Design a protein around this ligand. Structure first.
Ligand SMILES: CCCCCCCCCCCCCCCCCC(=O)OC[C@H](COP(=O)([O-])OCC[N+](C)(C)C)OC(=O)CCCCCCCCCCCCCCCCC
Ligand SMILES: CCCCCCCCCCCCCCCCCC(=O)OC[C@H](COP(=O)([O-])OCC[N+](C)(C)C)OC(=O)CCCCCCCCCCCCCCCCC
Ligand SMILES: CCCCCCCCCCCCCCCCCC(=O)OC[C@H](COP(=O)([O-])OCC[N+](C)(C)C)OC(=O)CCCCCCCCCCCCCCCCC
Ligand SMILES: CCCCCCCCCCCCCCCCCC(=O)OC[C@H](COP(=O)(O)OCCN)OC(=O)CCCCCCCCCCCCCCCCC
Ligand SMILES: CCCCCCCCCCCCCCCCCC(=O)OC[C@H](COP(=O)(O)OCCN)OC(=O)CCCCCCCCCCCCCCCCC
Ligand SMILES: CCCCCCCCCCCCCCCCCC(=O)OC[C@H](COP(=O)(O)OCCN)OC(=O)CCCCCCCCCCCCCCCCC
Ligand SMILES: CCCCCCCCCCCCCCCCCC(=O)OC[C@H](COP(=O)(O)OCCN)OC(=O)CCCCCCCCCCCCCCCCC
Ligand SMILES: C=C(C)[C@H]1Cc2c(ccc3c2O[C@@H]2COc4cc(OC)c(OC)cc4[C@@H]2C3=O)O1
Ligand SMILES: C=C(C)[C@H]1Cc2c(ccc3c2O[C@@H]2COc4cc(OC)c(OC)cc4[C@@H]2C3=O)O1
Ligand code: SF4
Lengths: 80, 47, 105, 314, 70, 167, 110, 156, 98
C-alpha cells in the first residue's frame, strides 16, 4: 500500500497530486463542521421581499416589527 | 426486374466490404537556419 | 406508450421545467403566471376533450397574454388614427406625451 | 466625451505595444550579456518608430491567395479582437463596465484563432497551413485550461464581474489561495499567445510568414496587444492591487507596475529556455495541466462550501 | 548597464497609465464630480432612473437631499 | 431607426443564412455562418440574455465553428450559388417592404409590423439577472438534466473514439 | 450602446490601418515581379490526430459550457444537490479524459 | 521651392527609417557565417543598430551573402533574393562571395555572387573580421541615407 | 405576434432548404444543419427571455451542448468519408443504391 504509492509518487507525481486533491474535495465537505453554515448563510440572504402575514390572531412566533425579539436571528452570523 | 436504367448495377460484395480505392514528402531546401548552413532535406513523413 | 415511471416511483425528473407556474428560483413569476395558473386549474382532471371546449376563455386569455396580438392590434389602431389626425392636423400631442413635463416620482 | 475615453484607451495600447518591442529587445539584450538598441533614439527610444515606418513602406506580397478577402480579414479581425479585449479591464474603472466581463474576455479570446486559421488559408503554401493547424490546436488546447482555471477562481470571486475581482482581493492577493491555478494559468496564457517556450512559428516556418510588413506589423502588434492584456488580466486575477476610490491612480500605478513586471517575466521566460516539441506541449496540456486543473476545480467547488466562505452574488 | 532598459519601461508604463487615469478623470467629469453609477442589476437601474427623474434636470447624478422636501 | 435595431439585426440574420445556404464553398459557408452567429447573438444580447449571448460567442463561434473551419482546412484542401443568393435576398426584401407598408403580414402565421420593444415587461428583478439564476438552477433543480447531459457527452467522447479508429 | 460605439471604433481603426498598410506602398511603382515551399504540388494529406484533438477540444469545451454557471450555482439553497452535481460533472470530464488517455487517443500529440 | 523641401524632408524620413531598421536574413553559407555570428555576438551586437536576424526572406531587408556560392546553390540563392520585398539590399561578405576567393578556379563555384544578384556592399576579407562586417553594414546604412527616391520622383 | 420571430423562422427554413436538395459537399450540409441549430437557439432564447420563464433559461444551453456534440459526431462521419474518397462530395455516397 506504500510501495505502489511511493512508486506512483516517483513516476507520476502530477497524477498523485490530482487524485489526492480530488479525493479531498469529494470527502472533506462530509467531514467539515462549517458545511452547515454555508447552507445557513445562503438561506439567510434576502433576495426577495419578506412578504408580511395577515395577523389572524394567533401567531406568537411571528414578530410585529423587525426589531422584535421573536423571529429568525443572525447572531450566529455576526459571531461565527 | 432490371430495367434500362437499373442494368449496370452489379451485386454488392459477399462480405459487404468494398476495396479502399501514401505518405507525405517534404523538401526542406536551402532556406533555413536551424539546419547548420547549406543542406537540402527530402523528408518522407507519415504524420 | 407513456410508461409513467416518475409517478410510479414517486420521483420528480422533469415536472419542474414543464410549466411557467411551477416553483422558480427566487420566486420569480413569469409574465403570464396568473393566466397559466387559471388555465391549468380550469383544465385539471376534466380531460383534454372537455378542456378544449370548457376552458376556452382562460386559454384565450393566456394565449393573448403570451402573444399580445389583441393588445398590439389595439395599439396599431390607436397609433394609426393618431398618425392620420397628425397628418390632417386635427390633433396635437399634449406636453406629457411630447416629453415636456418632468416625470412624477 | 465617451469617444475621448475610447481613444485614450486604444491609442496608448498601440503605443505601449510599440515600446514593448523596445523593452523586449533591451531586456533580452542585457540578459544575453549585450545591449539592445541604443543608437536610433537616445537609449533606443526611436527604434519602434523607425521600425514601424520601415515596415509600412516595404512592398507587400499580394500573392496568389486562396482567398483575397480572408487575407484582408485576418489582420482586421486580429487588431479588432486585440483592441476589444481591453474594454472591460477594470483599471480601476473599465471603459465598458459589464456584468460578465470575464466571460466576455474568454469568448473574445476564443475568437482569436480565426486569425491564425484564415492566415493559414490565405497563403497557398500547404506547409504554412499545417503550421497554422498546429497553432490552432495549441491555442484551443490551452483555452480549455484557461476556462477551467478562470472558473475555479471566479468561484472565489462570486460573479463574472471584473470590477468585483478588486473587491475580492482587498485583504489578500488571490495568488495565495490559488497559486497552483496561478502558475498553470500563467503558463497557459504563455501558450495562448504563441510565446516561447510554446512558439512554433520560428522553427520546425509559421502561419504568418506569408505576410510582409504591411499586414505583418499589424498582426505582430495585435499579437503583442494580446500579451500585455493577458498579463494585465493576470494582474487583475491573482495580484489585485489596493483601490482607494478617492485616488484611483494609486490602483492605476500599482496594477501598471505589476503588469509591467509580469510582461517582463514573459520576456525573462523566453530568454531562459529552449522550445517545446509540439507533442510535448500537447503532453503538457492534456496529461499534466488538465488533470490538476480538474482536481483543483473540484477543490474550489467544494472548498467555499466546506469553509462557509461562499462569496457574494452581487 | 541594466538601467538603460528603464527609459523604455518608463515610456511603456506611462502608456499603460494613460487609459486608467483617463477613464477615471472622464468618469469624474461626466458624473458630477463622482464615480459612474454601476448598474449591473435592475434594482440599480431603477434607482438610477428614479434619480434621473427626481433631479429635474434629466441627469441621474444631480443629487437632491433634504432641501428638496419641505 | 434605433427603435427597430433588433429587427434590423434579424434582417441581417436572414441575409446571413442566405449568405451561406447558397453554398459557394464550405469555407465561405463557414464565414457566413460565423457572421450570422454574431448578428443573432446581437439579437440575443439585446433582450437581456447576456449569458446566452456569451454562450453563442464562446461555444458556438469560439468552440464549434472553429472545429468546422479546422476540418474544412484539413479535409477539404458561380451561377447556382449567386442565383439562390439573389433569389432569397429578393424574397426577404419583398417581405420587408410588405411588413413595412402594411404593419401586418401573413406567410404562415400572423405577424405584427411594429417593433418588438412593445412586447416587453415594465418590472425589475432586483439584484440578479433572472436568466443567470435560471441557468444557475441547472445544479439545484436540474439534476436529471445534468445526469443525461453528462452521460451523453461521455458517450459522445466514447463514440468519437470508436468511429474515428477504423478498426 | 456605448459598447457598440467601442466595437465600431475598433473595427474602424483596424480597417483604417489595414487599408493604409495595403495601399501606402501601392503608391510606389517599385518593379513588376514574375517570381516563377516544402511540398511542391502534393495534395495535403489528412492528419487524423489533428482532427482528434479538435473534437476532443469541442467535447471538453461543451463540458466547460456545462461547468460555466457554477459561481452562480454556489449561491443556491440546495447546496448538497448542487455540490453533488458539480463534482459529478467534473468527474465525468475526468472520466472522458481517462478514456481519452487509456485508449491511446492522446498520442503523438500527447 | 517648397515642395522640394517637403520631398527632401520625406526622403530624409524614409531613408532614416530604412537604414535604422535593417533586417538581415539569418542565412550563412560558409566560414563567413561564423564571423557574421560574431557580429551578432555581444561584443559587436548588431541589435543595437536596429539590425536583427529574421528567418524568412519575407520579413527581411538585406541579404548578407556570407560564404561560398557554389554552382549547386545559386538558384536557391536567387530564389531567396526573389522572395525579398523591395527595397532589398545585398552585402557580399568575404572573398568567395565577392569574387570566388580561394575556390575561384573551381568547376563548382560561382565566381562572385554578383553574377547571381546585384550587390550593394562588397566586404573584403577571408573572412572579414566581425568589426569589418559591421563597417560594411554601416556603409550600407550611409548608402541608404543618401538615397533620393522622392526627389527623383518629384523631378520625373 | 412578434416580428423578429418571423425572421428567425425564415432563417430556419432557408437553412432547411439549403440542407435538403443540393447534392454538394457534405460539410456544406453540416453547415446548413448547424445554421438550423443556431436559429433554434436564437428562437428559444427570445421566447424564454420574452416570457420571463426562468427555469427554461438553462434550456438553450442544453440545446447548444447536445447539438454541438451531434455536430462533432457528424464531422467524424465526414472524416471517415474524407478517409475513403479524398473528397466530401455526397455523390460518392452511392454504393448502397445496389
Ligand atoms: C501568475 C504569476 C506567476 C506564476 C508562476 C510562474 C512563474 C515561473 C515560471 C518559470 C518558467 C516556466 C516556463 C514554462 C515551463 C513549462 C514546463 C513545466 O513546468 O511543466 C509543468 C510540469 C509538467 O511535468 P514535467 O514536464 O516536469 O514532467 C514530465 C511529466 N511526467 C512526470 C508525467 C513524465 O509540472 C506540472 O504540471 C505542475 C503544474 C503545477 C502543479 C501545482 C501543484 C500544487 C501542489 C498541491 C499539493 C501537492 C502536495 C501533495 C498533496 C498534499 C495535499 C494536502
Ligand atoms: C449517479 C447518480 C448521482 C446523482 C444521484 C442523485 C443525487 C441527488 O441528491 O439528487 C437529488 C435531486 C434533487 O432532489 P432534492 O433532494 O434536491 O429535492 C429538493 C427539492 N428541490 C430540488 C426542488 C430543491 O434529484 C432527485 O431527487 C431526483 C432526480 C435524480 C434522481 C437520481 C437519478 C440517477 C440516475 C442514474 C443513472
Ligand atoms: C502609421 C504611422 C506610419 C505611417 C507610415 C510612415 C509615414 C510616411 C508615409 C509616406 C512616405 C512616402 C511614401 C512612401 C515611401 C516611398 C518610398 C519610395 O520608394 O518612393 C518612390 C516612389 C516612386 O518613385 P519613382 O518614380 O522613383 O519609382 C521608382 C520605381 N520605378 C523607377 C521603377 C518606376 O514614390 C511614390 O510612390 C510617391 C508617393 C507619394 C510620396 C509622398 C507624398 C506626400 C505625402 C505626405
Ligand atoms: C476517488 C478520488 C477522485 C477520483 C476522480 C477524479 C480524478 C481527478 C484527476 C483526473 C485525471 C484524469 C485522467 C486519469 C487517468 C488515470 C489512468 C492513467 O493515467 O494510467 C496510466 C498511467 C501510466 O502512464 P502512461 O500510460 O505511460 O501515460 C504516459 C505517461 N507516462 O498510470 C498511472 O498514472 C497510475 C494511476 C493510478 C494510481 C494513482 C494513485 C494516486 C493516489 C493519491 C493519493 C490517494 C487519493 C485518493 C483517491 C484514490 C486514487 C487512486
Ligand atoms: C467577418 C465579419 C467581421 C469580423 C470582425 C468584426 C467582428 C469581430 C470583433 C467584434 C466582436 C463583437 C462582440 C460583441 C458582443 C460581445 C458580448 C457582449 O455584448 O457582452 C457584454 C455585455 C454583457 O454584460 P451585461 O453587463 O449583462 O450587459 C449590460 C447589462 N447591464 O452586453 C452588453 O453590454 C450588451 C450591449 C448591447 C448589445 C451589444 C451587441 C453588439 C453587436 C452584435 C455583434 C456585432 C458583431 C457581429 C460579428 C461577430 C463576430 C463574427
Ligand atoms: C506616452 C509617452 C510617449 C512617448 C513617445 C516618444 C518617446 C521619445 C521622445 C523623444 C526623445 C528624443 C528624440 C530626439 C531625436 C534626435 C533629435 C536630433 O537632434 O536630431 C537631429 C536631426 C538632424 O539635426 P541637424 O540639425 O541636421 O544636425 C546638424 C547639427 N549641426 O534632426 C532631426 O532629425 C529633426 C528633429 C527630429 C526630432 C524628433 C523627436 C522625436 C519625435 C518622436 C515622436 C513622438 C514625440 C512625443 C509625442 C508625445 C508627447 C507630445
Ligand atoms: C514643411 C516641413 C515639414 C515637411 C514634412 C515633414 C514632417 C516631419 C517628418 C519627420 C522629420 C523629418 C526629418 C527626419 C530626419 C532628418 C535628419 C536626420 O536624418 O538626422 C540623422 C540622425 C541620425 O544620424 P545617424 O547617421 O543615423 O547617426 C549614426 C549614429 N552615430 O537622426 C536622428 O538623430 C533622429 C531622427 C529622427 C527622425 C524623426 C522622428 C521619427 C518620425 C516621427 C514622426 C512620424 C511618425 C509618427 C509616429 C508613427 C507611429 C510610431
Ligand atoms: C541567430 C543569431 C543571433 C546568430 C546565429 C546564426 C546567425 C546567422 C546565421 C546562422 C546562425 O546560426 C545557424 C546555426 O549555426 C550555424 C553554424 C554554421 O557554421 C558553424 C553555419 O555555417 C554556414 C550556419 C549556421 C546557421 C546560420 O546560418 O546569427
Ligand atoms: C510594432 C512595431 C512598432 C514594429 C516593431 C516590430 C514590428 C514588427 C515585428 C517585430 C517588431 O519588433 C521586433 C524586431 O526584432 C525582433 C527580433 C526577434 O528575434 C531576434 C524577434 O523574435 C521573436 C522579434 C522581433 C520583433 C518583431 O518581430 O513592428
Ligand atoms: S571568403 Fe573565405 S573565410 Fe569567407 S566563407 Fe569564403 S572560404 Fe570561408
Amino acid at each position: 500500500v506504500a510501495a505502489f504509492l511511493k512508486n506512483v509518487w516517483a513516476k507520476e507525481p502530477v497524477l498523485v497530486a490530482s487524485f489526492a486533491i480530488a479525493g479531498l474535495a469529494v470527502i472533506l465537505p462530509t467531514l467539515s463542521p462549517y458545511t452547515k453554515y454555508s447552507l445557513m448563510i445562503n438561506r439567510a440572504t434576502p433576495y426577495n421581499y419578506p412578504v408580511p402575514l395577515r395577523d389572524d390572531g394567533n401567531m406568537p412566533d411571528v414578530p410585529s416589527h423587525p426589531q422584535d425579539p421573536q423571529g429568525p436571528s443572525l447572531e450566529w452570523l455576526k459571531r461565527l | 426486374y432490371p430495367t434500362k436504367e437499373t442494368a449496370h448495377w452489379k451485386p454488392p460484395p459477399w462480405n459487404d466490404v468494398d476495396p479502399p480505392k501514401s505518405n507525405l514528402t517534404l523538401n526542406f531546401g536551402p532556406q533555413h537556419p536551424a539546419a547548420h548552413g547549406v543542406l537540402r532535406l527530402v523528408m518522407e513523413l507519415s504524420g | 406508450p407513456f410508461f409513467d415511471v416518475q409517478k410510479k416511483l414517486g420521483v420528480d425528473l422533469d415536472h419542474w421545467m414543464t410549466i411557467q407556474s411551477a416553483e422558480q428560483p427566487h420566486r420569480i413569476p413569469a409574465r403570464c403566471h396568473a393566466f397559466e395558473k387559471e388555465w391549468i386549474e380550469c383544465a385539471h382532471g376534466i380531460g383534454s376533450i372537455r378542456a378544449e371546449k370548457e376552458c376556452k376563455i382562460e386559454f384565450e386569455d393566456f394565449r393573448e397574454c403570451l402573444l399580445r396580438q389583441k393588445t398590439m392590434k389595439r395599439l396599431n389602431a390607436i397609433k394609426r388614427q393618431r398618425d392620420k389626425l397628425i397628418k390632417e392636423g386635427k390633433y396635437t400631442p399634449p406636453p406629457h406625451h411630447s416629453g415636456q413635463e418632468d416625470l412624477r416620482p | 466625451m465617451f469617444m475621448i475615453n475610447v481613444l485614450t484607451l486604444i491609442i496608448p495600447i498601440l503605443l505601449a505595444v510599440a515600446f514593448l518591442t523596445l523593452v523586449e529587445r533591451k531586456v533580452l539584450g542585457y540578459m544575453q550579456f549585450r545591449k539592445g538598441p541604443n543608437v536610433v533614439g537616445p537609449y533606443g527610444l526611436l527604434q519602434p518608430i523607425a521600425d514601424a515606418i520601415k515596415l509600412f513602406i516595404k512592398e507587400p506580397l499580394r500573392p496568389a491567395t486562396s482567398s483575397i478577402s480572408m487575407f484582408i480579414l485576418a489582420p482586421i479581425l486580429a487588431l479588432t479582437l486585440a483592441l476589444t479585449m481591453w474594454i472591460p479591464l477594470p483599471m480601476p474603472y473599465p471603459l465598458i463596465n459589464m456584468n460578465l466581463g470575464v466571460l466576455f474576455m474568454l469568448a473574445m479570446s476564443s475568437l482569436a484563432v480565426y486569425s491564425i486559421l484564415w492566415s493559414g488559408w490565405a497563403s497557398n503554401s500547404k506547409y504554412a497551413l499545417i503550421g497554422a493547424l498546429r497553432a490552432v490546436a495549441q491555442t484551443i488546447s490551452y483555452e480549455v485550461t484557461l476556462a477551467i482555471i478562470l472558473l475555479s477562481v471566479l468561484l472565489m470571486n462570486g460573479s463574472f464581474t471584473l470590477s468585483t475581482l478588486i473587491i475580492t482581493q482587498e485583504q489578500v492577493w488571490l495568488i495565495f489561495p490559488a497559486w497552483p491555478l496561478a502558475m498553470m494559468w500563467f503558463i497557459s496564457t504563455l501558450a495562448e499567445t504563441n510565446r516561447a517556450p510554446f512558439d512554433l512559428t520560428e522553427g520546425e516556418s509559421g502561419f504568418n510568414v506569408e505576410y510582409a510588413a504591411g499586414p505583418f506589423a499589424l498582426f505582430f502588434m495585435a499579437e503583442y496587444a494580446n500579451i500585455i492584456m493577458m498579463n494585465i488580466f493576470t494582474t487583475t486575477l491573482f495580484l489585485g492591487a489596493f483601490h482607494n476610490p478617492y485616488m484611483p491612480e494609486l490602483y492605476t500605478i500599482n496594477f501598471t507596475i505589476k503588469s509591467l513586471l509580469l510582461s517582463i517575466t514573459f520576456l525573462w521566460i523566453r530568454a531562459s529556455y529552449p522550445r517545446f516539441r509540439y507533442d510535448q506541449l500537447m503532453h503538457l496540456l492534456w496529461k499534466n495541466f488538465l488533470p490538476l486543473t480538474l482536481a483543483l476545480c473540484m477543490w474550489h467547488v467544494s472548498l467555499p462550501i466546506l469553509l462557509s466562505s461562499i462569496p457574494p452574488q452581487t | 548597464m541594466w538601467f538603460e532598459v528603464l527609459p523604455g519601461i518608463a515610456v511603456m508604463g506611462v502608456c499603460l497609465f494613460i487609459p486608467g487615469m483617463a477613464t477615471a478623470r472622464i468618469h469624474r467629469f461626466s458624473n458630477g464630480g463622482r464615480e459612474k453609477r454601476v448598474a449591473h442589476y435592475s434594482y440599480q437601474w431603477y434607482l438610477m432612473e428614479r434619480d434621473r427623474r427626481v433631479s429635474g434636470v434629466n441627469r441621474y447624478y444631480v443629487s437632491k437631499g433634504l432641501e428638496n422636501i419641505d | 431607426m434605433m427603435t427597430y435595431i433588433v429587427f434590423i439585426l434579424s434582417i441581417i440574420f436572414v441575409m446571413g443564412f442566405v449568405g451561406f445556404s447558397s453554398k459557394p464553398s464550405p469555407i465561405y459557408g463557414g464565414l457566413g455562418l460565423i457572421v450570422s452567429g454574431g448578428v443573432g447573438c446581437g439579437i440575443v444580447l439585446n433582450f437581456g440574455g447576456s449569458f446566452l449571448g456569451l454562450m453563442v460567442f464562446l461555444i458556438y463561434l469560439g468552440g464549434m465553428m472553429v472545429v468546422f473551419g479546422y476540418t474544412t482546412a484539413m479535409a477539404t484542401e458561380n451561377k447556382v450559388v449567386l442565383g439562390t443568393f439573389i433569389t432569397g435576398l429578393l424574397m426577404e426584401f419583398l417581405m420587408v417592404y410588405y411588413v413595412l407598408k402594411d404593419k401586418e403580414v401573413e406567410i404562415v402565421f400572423k405577424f405584427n409590423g411594429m417593433g418588438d420593444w412593445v412586447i416587453y415587461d415594465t418590472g425589475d428583478s432586483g439584484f440578479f439577472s433572472e436568466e443567470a439564476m435560471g441557468i444557475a438552477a441547472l445544479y439545484s433543480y436540474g439534476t436529471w438534466l445534468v445526469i443525461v447531459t453528462g452521460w451523453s457527452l461521455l458517450i459522445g467522447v466514447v463514440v468519437i473514439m470508436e468511429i474515428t479508429r477504423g478498426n | 450602446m456605448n459598447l457598440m460605439i467601442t466595437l465600431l471604433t475598433n473595427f474602424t481603426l483596424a480597417t483604417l490601418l489595414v487599408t493604409i498598410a495595403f495601399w501606402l506602398p501601392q503608391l510606389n511603382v517599385y518593379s513588376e515581379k514574375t517570381s516563377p515551399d516544402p511540398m511542391g504540388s502534393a495534395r495535403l494529406p489528412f492528419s487524423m490526430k489533428f482532427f482528434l484533438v479538435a473534437i476532443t477540444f469541442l467535447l471538453f469545451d461543451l463540458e466547460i459550457a456545462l461547468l460555466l454557471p457554477l459561481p452562480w450555482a454556489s449561491q443556491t439553497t440546495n447546496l448538497n444537490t448542487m455540490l453533488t452535481m458539480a463534482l459529478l460533472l467534473i468527474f465525468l470530464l475526468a472520466v472522458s479524459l481517462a478514456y481519452e488517455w487509456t485508449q491511446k487517443g492522446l498520442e503523438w500529440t500527447e | 521651392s517648397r515642395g522640394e523641401y517637403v520631398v527632401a524632408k520625406l526622403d530624409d524620413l524614409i531613408n532614416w527609417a530604412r537604414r535604422s531598421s535593417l533586417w538581415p536574413m539569418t542565412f550563412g553559407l560558409a566560414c563567413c557565417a561564423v564571423e557574421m555570428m560574431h557580429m551578432a555576438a555581444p561584443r559587436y551586437d548588431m541589435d543595437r543598430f536596429g539590425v536583427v536576424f529574421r528567418a524568412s526572406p519575407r520579413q527581411s531587408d538585406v541579404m548578407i551573402v556570407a560564404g561560398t556560392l557554389t554552382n549547386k546553390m545559386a538558384p536557391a540563392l536567387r530564389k531567396v533574393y526573389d522572395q525579398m520585398p523591395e527595397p532589398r539590399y545585398v552585402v557580399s561578405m568575404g572573398s568567395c562571395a565577392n569574387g570566388g576567393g580561394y575556390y575561384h578556379y573551381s568547376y563548382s563555384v560561382v565566381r562572385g555572387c554578383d553574377r547571381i544578384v546585384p550587390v550593394d556592399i562588397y566586404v573584403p576579407g577571408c573572412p572579414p573580421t566581425a568589426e569589418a562586417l559591421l563597417y560594411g553594414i554601416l556603409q550600407l546604412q550611409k548608402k541608404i541615407k543618401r538615397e533620393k527616391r522622392l526627389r527623383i520622383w518629384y523631378r520625373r | 405576434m412578434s416580428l423578429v420571430y418571423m425572421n428567425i423562422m425564415m432563417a430556419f427554413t432557408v437553412s432547411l432548404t439549403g440542407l435538403l436538395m443540393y447534392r454538394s459537399h457534405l460539410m456544406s450540409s453540416l453547415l446548413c444543419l448547424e445554421g438550423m441549430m443556431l436559429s433554434l437557439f436564437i428562437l428559444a432564447t427570445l421566447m424564454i427571455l420574452n416570457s420571463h420563464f426562468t427555469l427554461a433559461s438553462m434550456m438553450p444551453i442544453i440545446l447548444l451542448v447536445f447539438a454541438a456534440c451531434e455536430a462533432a459526431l457528424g464531422l467524424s462521419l465526414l472524416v471517415m468519408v474524407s478517409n475513403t474518397y479524398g473528397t466530401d462530395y455526397v455523390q460518392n455516397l452511392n454504393l448502397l443504391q445496389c
